[PDB]
Design an enzyme around this catalytic site. Sequence first.
Site, mmCIF file in Angstrom:
data_model
loop_
_atom_site.group_PDB
_atom_site.id
_atom_site.type_symbol
_atom_site.label_atom_id
_atom_site.label_comp_id
_atom_site.label_asym_id
_atom_site.label_seq_id
_atom_site.Cartn_x
_atom_site.Cartn_y
_atom_site.Cartn_z
ATOM 1 N N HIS A 1 -1.289 2.918 8.380
ATOM 2 C CA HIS A 1 -0.473 2.133 7.468
ATOM 3 C C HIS A 1 -1.303 1.462 6.383
ATOM 4 O O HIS A 1 -2.503 1.226 6.545
ATOM 5 C CB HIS A 1 0.399 1.103 8.225
ATOM 6 C CG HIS A 1 -0.332 -0.113 8.709
ATOM 7 N ND1 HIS A 1 -0.855 -1.061 7.857
ATOM 8 C CD2 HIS A 1 -0.554 -0.574 9.965
ATOM 9 C CE1 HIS A 1 -1.367 -2.053 8.566
ATOM 10 N NE2 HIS A 1 -1.195 -1.783 9.848
ATOM 11 N N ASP B 1 -4.581 -0.900 -4.009
ATOM 12 C CA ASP B 1 -3.177 -0.531 -3.931
ATOM 13 C C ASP B 1 -2.804 0.289 -5.170
ATOM 14 O O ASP B 1 -3.376 0.094 -6.239
ATOM 15 C CB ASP B 1 -2.343 -1.821 -3.848
ATOM 16 C CG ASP B 1 -0.858 -1.560 -3.715
ATOM 17 O OD1 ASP B 1 -0.477 -0.598 -3.014
ATOM 18 O OD2 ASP B 1 -0.072 -2.334 -4.304
ATOM 19 N N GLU C 1 -5.384 -7.914 -0.464
ATOM 20 C CA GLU C 1 -3.947 -7.920 -0.223
ATOM 21 C C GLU C 1 -3.594 -8.790 0.988
ATOM 22 O O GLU C 1 -2.706 -9.634 0.916
ATOM 23 C CB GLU C 1 -3.441 -6.496 0.015
ATOM 24 C CG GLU C 1 -3.391 -5.635 -1.235
ATOM 25 C CD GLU C 1 -3.201 -4.172 -0.913
ATOM 26 O OE1 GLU C 1 -4.195 -3.516 -0.540
ATOM 27 O OE2 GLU C 1 -2.059 -3.683 -1.022
ATOM 28 N N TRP D 1 -9.712 -0.131 -0.755
ATOM 29 C CA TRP D 1 -9.021 0.996 -1.364
ATOM 30 C C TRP D 1 -7.848 0.299 -2.066
ATOM 31 O O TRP D 1 -6.847 -0.047 -1.429
ATOM 32 C CB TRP D 1 -8.504 1.970 -0.297
ATOM 33 C CG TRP D 1 -7.726 3.139 -0.858
ATOM 34 C CD1 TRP D 1 -7.185 3.246 -2.113
ATOM 35 C CD2 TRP D 1 -7.343 4.330 -0.156
ATOM 36 N NE1 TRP D 1 -6.487 4.427 -2.231
ATOM 37 C CE2 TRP D 1 -6.566 5.111 -1.046
ATOM 38 C CE3 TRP D 1 -7.577 4.812 1.137
ATOM 39 C CZ2 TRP D 1 -6.022 6.346 -0.680
ATOM 40 C CZ3 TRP D 1 -7.036 6.043 1.500
ATOM 41 C CH2 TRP D 1 -6.267 6.794 0.593
ATOM 42 N N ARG E 1 -1.175 5.262 -0.081
ATOM 43 C CA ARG E 1 -2.491 5.514 0.492
ATOM 44 C C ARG E 1 -2.361 6.194 1.860
ATOM 45 O O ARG E 1 -3.100 7.126 2.181
ATOM 46 C CB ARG E 1 -3.247 4.184 0.592
ATOM 47 C CG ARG E 1 -3.594 3.601 -0.780
ATOM 48 C CD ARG E 1 -3.991 2.125 -0.718
ATOM 49 N NE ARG E 1 -2.839 1.244 -0.533
ATOM 50 C CZ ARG E 1 -2.907 -0.088 -0.531
ATOM 51 N NH1 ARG E 1 -4.072 -0.696 -0.704
ATOM 52 N NH2 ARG E 1 -1.811 -0.814 -0.359
ATOM 53 N N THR E 2 -1.417 5.726 2.665
ATOM 54 C CA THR E 2 -1.175 6.311 3.982
ATOM 55 C C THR E 2 -0.882 7.816 3.894
ATOM 56 O O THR E 2 -1.415 8.610 4.675
ATOM 57 C CB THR E 2 0.024 5.626 4.674
ATOM 58 O OG1 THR E 2 -0.333 4.289 5.049
ATOM 59 C CG2 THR E 2 0.444 6.404 5.914
#
EC number: 3.1.3.48
Length: 279
Positions: free
Chosen positions: A213, A171, A105, A169, A220-221
């Site tokens: 973040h 998105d 990302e 991880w 995810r946060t």
Amino acid sequence: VSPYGPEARAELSSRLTTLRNTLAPATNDPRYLQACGGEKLNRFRDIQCRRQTAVRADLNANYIQVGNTRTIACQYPLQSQLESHFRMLAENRTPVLAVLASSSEIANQRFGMPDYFRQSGTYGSITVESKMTQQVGLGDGIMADMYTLTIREAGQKTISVPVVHVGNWPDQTAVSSEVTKALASLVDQTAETKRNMYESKGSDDSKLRPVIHCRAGVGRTAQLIGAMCMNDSRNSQLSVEDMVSQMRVQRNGIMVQKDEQLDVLIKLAEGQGRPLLNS
Ligand SMILES: O=[N+]([O-])c1ccc(O)c(OS(=O)(=O)O)c1
């Protein structure tokens, strides 16, 4: 019958869905932080920052307290917000910065996600030195890359912040409950070692908060913050309904975006005998 059966789960989703729906931002919503004359504030137009808990006027970031656990959840800072982002990190004496956005990302320039922690840089009057530390495997091939960010600014106290970057991880997904636990442990331990250092030198509720973040700072946060909350012994009896409702009223109604992410929090709760619903 089963507190974790289909009926309980359906009731939980029902309550949370209504909450997300009613929390959707209206134009110039008084509940959400508004942009400063043209300058883009929100990375995602529909993913806003609860005004009451906003950390800084020019950042999409919120102070969050789930039960007794205090943290800061934010969006991946935009290029223009870097200096303010670093000031927030320093002023908070950030014990740990957990970045859950993937390397893919950040690398894709179409996403406008500045590689602000893996390399040194200068932003405004702030100079940042990045240093690589250890790498910790979290299970299922998920990896945590550690760094230290030394934030320097003329006339300001130099602050170094430990970084835990989960680089793979994906998105819009949820890593397993087991990986989530390994991650929550690492993040909590990283923060505790840092807090201990500050305390050993002679140390505020708004400070020493872990900062977390991902990309939008709601998927995810939120999964991680919820897991961190359940690892805090002070939150006995705090329900899953409470946790998610609190994250939502304190940031936005999207906190815990995917059903799969909620499912991880539910599984973790079940493992502790923690209630899903209130009453
Ligand atoms: O809910 N959203 O509108 C949203 C947008 C972009 C993301 O990358 C994302 O996922 S997140 O970064 O884990 O929060 C979630």
